[PDB]
Every structure is written in structure tokens, then in C-alpha cells.
Design a protein around this ligand. Sequence first.
Ligand SMILES: *[C@@H]1O[C@H](CO)[C@@H](O)[C@H](O)[C@H]1NC(C)=O
Ligand SMILES: *[C@@H]1O[C@H](CO)[C@@H](O)[C@H](O)[C@H]1NC(C)=O
Ligand SMILES: *[C@@H]1O[C@H](CO)[C@@H](O)[C@H](O)[C@H]1NC(C)=O
Lengths: 445, 445, 445
Amino acid sequence: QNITEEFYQSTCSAVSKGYLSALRTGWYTSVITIELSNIKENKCNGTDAKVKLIKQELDKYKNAVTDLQLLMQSTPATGSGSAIASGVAVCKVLHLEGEVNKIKSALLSTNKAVVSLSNGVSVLTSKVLDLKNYIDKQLLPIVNKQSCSIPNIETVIEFQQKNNRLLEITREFSVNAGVTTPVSTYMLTNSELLSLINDMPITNDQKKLMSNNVQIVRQQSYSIMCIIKEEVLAYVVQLPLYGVIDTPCWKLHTSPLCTTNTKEGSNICLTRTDRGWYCDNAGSVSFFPQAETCKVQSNRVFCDTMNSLTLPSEVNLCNVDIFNPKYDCKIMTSKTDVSSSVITSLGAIVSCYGKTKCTASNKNRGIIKTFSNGCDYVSNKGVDTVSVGNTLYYVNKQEGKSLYVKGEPIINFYDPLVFPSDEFDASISQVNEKINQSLAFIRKS
Amino acid sequence: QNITEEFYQSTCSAVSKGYLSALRTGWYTSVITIELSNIKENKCNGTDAKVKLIKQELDKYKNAVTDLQLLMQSTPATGSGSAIASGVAVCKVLHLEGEVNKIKSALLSTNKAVVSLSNGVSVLTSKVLDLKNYIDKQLLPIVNKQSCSIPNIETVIEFQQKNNRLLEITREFSVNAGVTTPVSTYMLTNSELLSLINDMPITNDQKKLMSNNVQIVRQQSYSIMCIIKEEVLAYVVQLPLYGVIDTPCWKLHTSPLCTTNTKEGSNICLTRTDRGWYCDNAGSVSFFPQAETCKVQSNRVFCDTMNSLTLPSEVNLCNVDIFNPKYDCKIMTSKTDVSSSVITSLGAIVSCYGKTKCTASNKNRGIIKTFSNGCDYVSNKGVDTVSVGNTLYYVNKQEGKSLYVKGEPIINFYDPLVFPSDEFDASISQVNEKINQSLAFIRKS
Amino acid sequence: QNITEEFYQSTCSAVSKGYLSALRTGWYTSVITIELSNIKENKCNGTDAKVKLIKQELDKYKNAVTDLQLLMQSTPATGSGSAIASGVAVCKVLHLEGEVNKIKSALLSTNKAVVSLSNGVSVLTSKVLDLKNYIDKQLLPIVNKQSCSIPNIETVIEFQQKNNRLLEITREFSVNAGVTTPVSTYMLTNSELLSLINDMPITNDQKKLMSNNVQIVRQQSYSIMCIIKEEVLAYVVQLPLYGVIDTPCWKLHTSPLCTTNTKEGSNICLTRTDRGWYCDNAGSVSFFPQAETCKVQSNRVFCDTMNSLTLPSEVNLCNVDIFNPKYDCKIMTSKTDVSSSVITSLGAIVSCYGKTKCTASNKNRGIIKTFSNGCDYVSNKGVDTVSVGNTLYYVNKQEGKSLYVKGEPIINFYDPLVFPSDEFDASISQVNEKINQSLAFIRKS
Ligand SMILES: *[C@@H]1O[C@H](CO)[C@@H](O)[C@H](O)[C@H]1NC(C)=O
Ligand SMILES: *[C@@H]1O[C@H](CO)[C@@H](O)[C@H](O)[C@H]1NC(C)=O
Ligand SMILES: *[C@@H]1O[C@H](CO)[C@@H](O)[C@H](O)[C@H]1NC(C)=O
């Protein structure tokens, strides 16, 4: 993928192109089980040190089960849910009588198995840990008899190793009220996640995609605690399904565009709004305003559509013609000419105002460019850093072509006296109509 | 508790009723101690593998103590403190001479004990781990002699198990500058927290409440590191006291209300402000503007009053009469008619504008409702999902009654030419006075 | 350091003085290595319990290596990087052929060593864990032979202890896409961090500073995963270099200043903007608008300059003369007279409006001050708490002098009819010019 960039001197904005989409549009839920031991505490005459270690680890197992039980009695809402409703619907099905016996039968001989639930959902079930088998075969002869049998030291160590994952899962579920994201390796090991991806009803390009970006998949997944019932600990892992793939995506960067008069109070400023990630999606554009909602790997963006707005494709025209009537290009205005910089994908936008010392340097040559007052841009070819005031920014060293699109700063087309200089969410045409109204108040007088 | 909802078509807003309050109004501090060993490193001729394992674990114990000591030399401020000032006042009392000896005497024979501090605060002290007893009885004969004694392998394992909680507490305290929240099971086990709740000077309904919502209690508690002095590691657990209980609470949901003309630039929009949680409190209303400050379990809201504003009870009138003079109903205005949806407790508000494809579907029947341009609502009875543009929302499947309160959208009562369309925090009456002023500028001409 | 405070009754704002700066201006990168074993899985006839435990722990080691390898195949971007570009440049140098052999040679005999990389960067390299030596000397005779040798139980325990740090580092790197901050003790132990600080090319006051604030240093550091190649696991720890030291720093606190008429809709409000931390820096002022970007220890502020704005030193005049022409003092206006309080360093600002019950109490005397409608302040001498509505705030008990600078509230100098009451980012002079324009629209009529 070739990354390119375009700086628009007229609007103090830049667009980083060449990115490929992967938008989450669906969920794939899967049930993860832990076979438990319904054993109850047993006391026999015991004093030998190995028996003490076993009984100690057994109490940590019993507390882990009772803690998961009181966690499951009352499960907290997470702000209208919605991003978890798929998995929550599976946990509600699991509470039906006979449903845990169904998964208990399918995972009787193998670790993984597909199960058709009683609501038409074909889930992939897995049994990642078997504590009932270990406790009932290796532990019960030690406490369940009348006088305690003496266990070998390998058993004490093996039981602390096996019981550890149960304790860590209970720890994560306790501090997070039953809903964890990202999904840890305790909830699902990388081996188990990759095997679950491979066993999913998705295309081979989607398996290659999710398997090559497992850390992003983990960060966009949920682990929801279901139920403890009949020697079964069940919880749902909700994995992202990327319904939108390889569509063009671009990132808009904006910076304040002010006039540069020498008398403070005589300068006006404007800034394009709606900076962030845009991706082509189903004849429209999916816009992601929040900064943390899109993870980038290589030239691929991984977004969740739940945090997006759907805009007409004409919103891209704000990048080629901001004065263009097919879409009302939104701006904000002010008189706050404070210097700043924005590090883009292939360079840096610099808004320099007042007495601020703005420059672009190379590590061994020193200052190679001094910015004047206004908004400007520099590519990363030959530039390592950008300094604005007392702050030093590092330029991204990604290879790509930048294009400096020269043009008159549009802030110069505005008469300062009638400019609306404190708008917080104004359109280009909205500002023009407010100027037409301020010109009518002066026209009559 | 019966959950009900009311959608106001006139203002594009909904109120989810029937919730019960639990507001934090106080703090209950309690001291958690770990009895340490003032042992110093001892070297004897040692080479046997068991001695090596013991000395290794002993170095991890010594580093944990010195790390807690350098953490305690300089303890960082957490933004004016205040939400921790109770516990901080107890740590400052603990630094007095003789105060650690007081708790050291009360916890000499039992694990838990009430201690009257020298500042009038009756704290509950607990001794959750005893490393001085284990190290001095089981470890000192191994290194403190002239030539090392050989320990049995059970001791090596028992010491790694006992020392683990100390190491994990030091780990959490190191990355968080001595203040952790939520309070982990390492800081306080569920058994110890429930026993501390049971032993608190509170009513039985408050013990049942905190014991049935321990994960919410943990998320609203603080663990503050106090002092390492005289073989004692002390830290304060600050637990919430809910002074407001079972008062009605409701959640306000708002969405943009625009006009639906076919020419862009001719539409005006308004949105009610102050969406969030409201709870009746002491003759006024406690409002919670931040989204993460209230955890909901069942029909109970658990808020911290520190993040609230106190409003007159007349603020509820913005839900029945927004044009009502007892309270100045606040709105924001704009021309940004971008489609969106809000998932409520019992349905979904949909603001559909432009060419956006808005619909409500059932999983097996398909599209059951198509929204027209404007603001509308659909209940969760028979609806599973709501799609707006390229985004699919899941409706909460909670049982309850919705009431669709029909009414003329108030945005239609405004002449567009004189509407103030870029207000960021305007009142209903503020907009009307600004319209009266814009009508005076046209009246004279 | 003497902490002082000044409340300006005229502007409802306070300044907390006497703080010393420590601003991050540079990065010191250092390479942290783990010597790995390129062993491959070996199967021999094995059934004895000790052999099983060893092979189990060996599989956890092999998965940890393959997981770090698939994490290193595709490393995610973190929003234009920049705050990590130093360490990222070192990881890119490390990918060159012969560079891992260079650090492999320098750390052949000692744990720490300075290495001149092939790009002119003199990094400090460290070898914190040696798994190749342990696996190849103690483990290979157990599986690599034809039939398995029987290991002693001390080896099983020693290998679980040594392998643990590798597994935890892989766990943190897996959930965080290769970039962790703060830097945990697994990434770098306190002993290793202090030794790295001591071995840094910095002054002795900077070593005393970083060593006395290691938790703040950890919170302002990054751990970046580099490469797995040729029996070497390498990752860069990027530590802050504080180029600005002991410069005066002050914290500005602001609260709404409204008029107190008895008829709602007739009151106007103003609030000073740009509250936060200000520090003198190189002839200008470095301002930190975000609340979480500055950690305070003692009277020292630790900020990262990346999150700062550079302002002229005349910005301090907004604290002594807000109507002063050398700097255009910024404000926001509204009609939202909701009561609130701000806990400062030495007292509390209280904005009381409407019917709100505002008071300041002592724990044993009760209410010692009742605030009237308007903006006021109380020092912490004799005051423990401040109650506003249903909310109780704790006053910081830090010792210092407060100065109440009496003055007429500037909101009283404004005629309400022509006040711009919905400005979101207005200057004092901007509001005056907008008033001059509203006076011209009434002057003609
Ligand atoms: C403002 O005036 C210009 C000039 O006649 C006109 O073209 C424009 O449509 C008017 N209104 C707006 C909203 O720009
Ligand atoms: C605006 O005009 C109406 C009509 O006379 C009046 O009732 C109202 O009080 C005026 N002022 C405001 C602030 O609404
Ligand atoms: C507003 O009017 C006053 C009075 O003449 C004048 O001093 C001031 O410069 C004018 N303009 C502004 C922007 O304050």
C-alpha cells in the first residue's frame, strides 16, 4: 500500500491517504468452559506439610468458586450494554435448564465442539481447563477418605499450576464486574484464540486477517461472565467480525488558521472541524470522531462502527473545495491564535503565531526550516523534528509522497469587523449568512 | 422495581424511571496491616539447592520492603486529593510515635480488632498476613545460624505462597504511586472485605447492600499506602458509606431535534442538555453529568456525590413542560443535522436526517419499522436492533413499559431567519430573548 | 519550599504558587535484553512426574517465544507515535544485520554495558535474565538426550521462577500491542531502574531527582518491544530527561462568577479559562491544559512538554490585572449559575448561587462559615470541609499562607442587556468589542 499525503495551505488541513479498512460490523460469540469440581471441604486428621499445602490450594479453589458465584448473582449493567448484547443474549440462553447439559455433552470427549443452542445460534464451545478431572482423580483420595492420604510433591506443584488460571480469571472478573476488554490470555490464550479464529465460519482472508492482528482483535473483543451451574464455569468471548474490508480510508488533520496582524485583538481564526478517520462504507462514508476508536496496523485501520457517524460521500469535498455547495463544510472560529503543531502520517502541520519560534530540524544538520506566521507544512523527507515554542515533536519516519497544495488562506477572504469570531460549530455557509446579517445591520445605518 | 420509560417527541428526549439510589456521602476508613520481619540479609556457607531457593525468595522479600520504603519516603499528591482526605488523615495520624504500637498491641492475639486512634477515630484494624512469625520461626534457623540449616521442600513452597501477596501489593502500589482504586483482592480479599463490611458501624440493610454489590463497592473504594515502621506495613482502605438510599433516580437521554427541509442550510437544530443520571436527594436533585460516575446494578444506581451538581427539584419540569418558567430548561443549538441514535433503558431514540437509512428490526422478521426524517422512538417490545446509516445498535432487552408522549417538535415554533443557531449553552428563555433582540434589529428597519 | 495562594475575588480565580518545575524535554533510550534458548521441542520416553512438570513449563516458554514473534511481525502504530519515536528509531537500528551481535558481544561477560550503535547513539544495554544459560545447562540433559533424564525437584521450582518474568513480559506486551506505560517492575525492576539512572549521562542532581521519584519516572516512561532474533529478546526503555528544572510553577483555579439577582434569566456569568499548571520555561511560560499531564510530588511538578502550549510570560497578568492590554485575558460567558466549588492547594473557592446551601465546617466546631450568593474563598486554616448543596469536599491540609485579594466582581461592570452571554472562548477585549457593536445597534435606534 502506498501512503500519500496532501496539505491544503488554504484551510490549514492535511489528508493522509492509502489506508485500507477493517470495520467491525458483527460479533461472533463463543462459549469458553471450565469443568469444575463440586467437591465440598473435607477435614481429616492432617498435619504433614504436603497435606497442608494441598488444603491451602483447595481453599483458594473454593473461594474462587464462591466468588464467581456471588459475582454471578448480580451482574452489573455497562451503560445500556449494546456493545455486549450478543454475548449477553447467549448468557441468558445458557441460564435455561438443560442448556449447560447440552454443552456438557458436546464437550464430553473433546476440548472443542460446535453446539446448536436452543435459540438458533450455532456457537463454538471449548473446554480450556478440567479441574473436575484433576481434583476428583488426584485430590479426592487425599481428603475425601477418613484419614488423609499423603500426596507426592509433584501433585502439590501441579495443582498450584492448574488452579492458577482459575484464580486469575476470577481476579479479572472481580475487579471488572464480569466484563473484561481487552480479552486477556487468561481468558483466552493466543493458542486458543488462533484455533478459535481458524474454526470460525468466516472466509480464509478473514482468518488470515484476524490471525495476523490478534492483539487488535483482543483489544476489540469482550469476555462476559455467564454462569456457574452443575460443575461448569461458562463465559462468552465476543469476537469482532469485520464486515467492511479493504475500502479506502483516510485521516483528516486540522490546525488553526489565523490572520497574522501585529496588533492583538485584530486577528481572526478558523479551524476545520471533524478531524479523524474516514473510511468508504457501503456507498457512504463512516467517520470516526473519537481518537481512540481506531487502531492502525501497517496501512490497515481497525475501527468499530458503533462509534462512527455515517456521512454522505460528498463530505470528502471539504478536502478539495471547502466553499463547495454539495456539502456544508463545517468550521469553528475564534480569536485564539496560540501556536501549535500536528504530526501527520508523512509530515507536520505548523500553526505559528505571535512571537513563537517555529522550526524544523535534522538531527545532524540542525535547523533546516523556519516557519513564518501562519499555517504551514513540512514533509518528513529530511526532517526529523519540529519545534514549536518549548516543545519538540518527532516526525513519523514512514515512507510516502507528500503534496503541498498551495492556496490562499481562506481566512483572508473575511472582513474582520463582521466576522463571527466565537463560533463553536459553524458551517461555511452558516458563517456567510451570519455575515450577510451583520452586513444588513450596517447597511441600514 | 418496575422500570418505565417516557419518550417526549416534542423535545427528542427520554426519561428512564423506577431506579433506586445509593449515593456515597461518607467514608469508612480501616487499617490493614502486614506483620513484617526486620530481619537483615544473612550469609552462611550455602550451596544446596533448597537453601538457594530460600535465599532467592528472601531477596524478593527484602526488595519488596525497601521498595515500599522508598515509595513511602515521598508520596505523590493526586490532584488536590479530597476524595482520599479521610484515609490520608489516618495515615498522618499513624505517623505519630506510639500509634503503630497501639495497633500492634490490639492485633497481638487476634487478626481483627477495633482501635480508638489518638484523634478520636474508631478504626477497624486487621492483620491479614504474618511474615514476621513465619520468617522468624521457619526461616531464621536456616540463615541466621553460623552455617545454614537445610530446609525441607514444603517450606520453600510455603514461603513462595506467603510472600506472594506482599510482592503483588508492592507491585500495585509501585505503579500507582501508593493510591489504588478499585481495591484489588490482593489489597483486600473478598472474604476480608465481606468480614469488614459485616463488622462496620452501619445498619443491616447497608451491610446487605454492600455485601450484595462488592464489585461496585471495590470500584468505589481506595487503598492508600500509610507507613512502614517497626515491623509493620500499614495501609488504609477507604470504603464508601451510602448516606442516600432508595430515593427515586431517573436517567435523561437527549438527541438532536432538527427541522427536515430538503435544502441544506435551511435547517435548524436543538438539543436538550444535561443528559445523565438524576436522583432525589434531601429536598433537591443530585445530577451526575459524567457518564462513568454511576454504576447500575439491577434497578439500583451507585453514584459518588463528589461528582454531582445539586439542582432544584424543579429541574424535572424540563421533562414535562420545557417552556415552563419555574426552571430555565437548557438547550444547545446548531445546524448539524447528522443522524444518530441513543439506546435507552427500554427502547431507542432515533434522529434521522438527510438521506440516512434508519430502521428497526427483529432478528427473524426483518425490518419492522422505518423512521422518517425527524426524531422518533421505538420500544424494545418486538425490536432487537436499530440501524442508522452503517451502524447497528442492539436494544436493551429489559422488561418494562414505554410511553410515547406525542407532541409537536418544538423546533418548529422557531422562525429560522432569527433563530440563534450556534449556541453552545443556551436556555429556552435565553434563546427567546436573543430572538426578541434579533426581532428588534429587523423591526426598526 | 513555601506554598502560597492568592484568591482574586474580582475574577473568582486562585493561584497556588511556590512549586518547582521538572519538565520533560528529552528521552534517554536503553536496551533491555533477555538471553533466550533457541531450543526446539524434544520428546523422549517420559512419564515421571518431574519430567512432566519440566515439559509443561517448557511449553509455556516456547509459547512465550512464539507469541513475542507474532507480536513482532506486525507492530501497531500508536497515533502518529512521536512520543515514542526515539525508542522506535532504536528498534529500527536493532533490526540491522550485525546489530544484535554487537549487543550480544558487549553483554557476553557482564550484565550491563555501554554500546555505540551504528547510528551514533550511545545506549546503555542490560541483560536482565539469562534463559539460554539455564535451559542449555540444566534443561537440555533432561529432554535433548535419547531417553529423558530425571530432574531434581529444585530444578522444577527454579525454572518456574526464572521463566515467570518472561511470561509476564509477554503478557503485558500482548495486551498493549508492544508499547507499555507506565513501565512495570517486570519490564524493569526498581533495582534495575535505579542502577540505570545511576549509570546515565546526567548530572548528579538529576540522578537524585529521578531516584527519589521513581514512581513518577515510571509513569512517564515507555517500554517498546524491539526484536526477537538470534537468541535475543530486546526491548527499549525510554526514560524521561527533565531539561527544565526548578523554575517557578503555579496552578490556576477558576470558578463561575455570576451576578446574584433574584429573578432567573436576569443573571450573567463569566469564567476565566485556561485553568491548570503554568511553569516558567526559557523566557516563556509552558501551560498544561490537560489535568492528567502533571504529577505533583512535594512542591515539584513533573510535566511532559509534549502536552503543553508555549505562552508569552505576559499571560501571568491575567492574575494581577485581567483588563490589562499586554495580554488578552480569555473568558467564557454563560447564564448557567449552578453552584460549585474548587478545592485549591490551600483552601477552596465557592461559587454559590440560587438557593444552594454553601458552608465551611470544622470537624469538632461545626459550621464556621456560611457563603453568600457570589464567589468566595476560604483558607484551610481551621477549615476541614466545604459543603455545597448535597456535596461535601475535603480541604487539603497542606501548610501555607493564603491571601484574599478583595476586589469588585468584574461581572458587575457589564450591562446585562448587551452582555454576550453564550460565548465559549471569548477574550476580555473580544467581549468589549462585541458590546461596542451591540451598543451601535441600539445607538442608531
Ligand atoms: C449571502 O449573500 C450572498 C451574496 O448575495 C448570497 O449568494 C448568499 O446566498 C447569501 N446567503 C448565504 C447563507 O450565504
Ligand atoms: C420576549 O418577548 C415576549 C413577547 O412579549 C415576552 O413575553 C418575553 O418576556 C420577552 N423576553 C424574553 C427573555 O423572553
Ligand atoms: C470599544 O469602545 C471603547 C470606548 O471607546 C474603546 O476604548 C475600545 O477600544 C473599543 N473597542 C474594543 C475592541 O474594546
